[PDB]
Amino acid sequence: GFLPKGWEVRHAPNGRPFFIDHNTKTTTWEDPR
């Protein structure tokens, strides 16, 4: 499904996806969906 408003996902150097919270200018390994 689509990420919540303000979020995106990218891949870290180690290849693991991380999620980016532009609403609070923070990131996390955990999927927010």
């Binding site: 990218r10 990131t27 996390t28």
Partner: peptide, 9 residues
């Protein structure tokens, strides 16, 4: 093994 911080985006 922490994620990249927001400054790295």
């Amino acid at each position: 093994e922490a994620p990249p911080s927001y400054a790295e985006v």
